[PDB]
Design a protein around this ligand. Structure first.
Ligand SMILES: CC(C)[C@H](Nc1ncnc2[nH]ccc12)c1ccc2c(c1)S(=O)(=O)CCC2
Length: 164
């Protein structure tokens, strides 16, 4: 199971950890990917999860987009978790560096409520340009299911916990 997490609320937990390493250790039912609408897993969390699958996540993702078209910002899709989890929930948070509306961050976190328990990153943080403190607050105020957040930066983890 999940270990070494700090409990923030009745249902939100947080740890300073690499989500790829956490997925390989736990093999959760659901791992969330910080996806873009095209499912092009080039960098950040998406690039790291895809590299751990030996590119099998990208091959599956390109077939999904060829059939269905792109996702919406704030939307999601369920695909295989490959060697990392039973399933991967690909969720698109708004990328502020592309001028996407930050209000769509709450819609993105609502996708988590369709799963009883998930391993996830903070949406729209990092190269998506949003304030991580804001992302954690939207997470706690929107997600009702059990979410285990992996934040791979000790300095940011300490700032998130000390300001919570
Ligand atoms: C540095 C943290 C803010 C964090 N990094 C991480 N958090 C957890 N496992 C990780 N493995 C490798 C890095 C990594 C973070 C959280 C969310 C997002 C990104 C980064 S991003 O990939 O830059 C863009 C998408 C959203």
């Amino acid at each position: 199971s999940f270990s070494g997490y700090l409990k923030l609320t009745d249902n939100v937990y947080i740890k300073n950890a690499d989500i790829v390493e956490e997925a390989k250790k736990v093999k959760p039912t659901v791992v969330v990917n910080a996806a873009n609408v095209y499912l092009k897993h080039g960098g950040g969390v998406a690039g790291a999860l895809n590299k751990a699958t030996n590119n099998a996540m990208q091959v599956e993702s390109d077939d999904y987009i060829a059939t269905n078209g792109p996702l919406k910002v704030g939307g999601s899709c369920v695909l295989s978790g490959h060697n990392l989890a039973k399933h991967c929930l690909h969720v698109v948070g708004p990328n502020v560096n592309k001028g996407e509306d930050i209000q769509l961050l709450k819609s993105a976190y609502e996708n988590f409520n369709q799963h009883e328990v998930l391993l996830a990153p903070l949406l729209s943080a990092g190269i998506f340009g949003a304030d991580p403190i804001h992302s954690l607050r939207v997470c706690v105020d929107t997600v009702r299911t059990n979410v285990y957040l992996a934040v791979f930066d000790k300095n940011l983890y300490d700032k998130l916990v000390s300001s919570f």
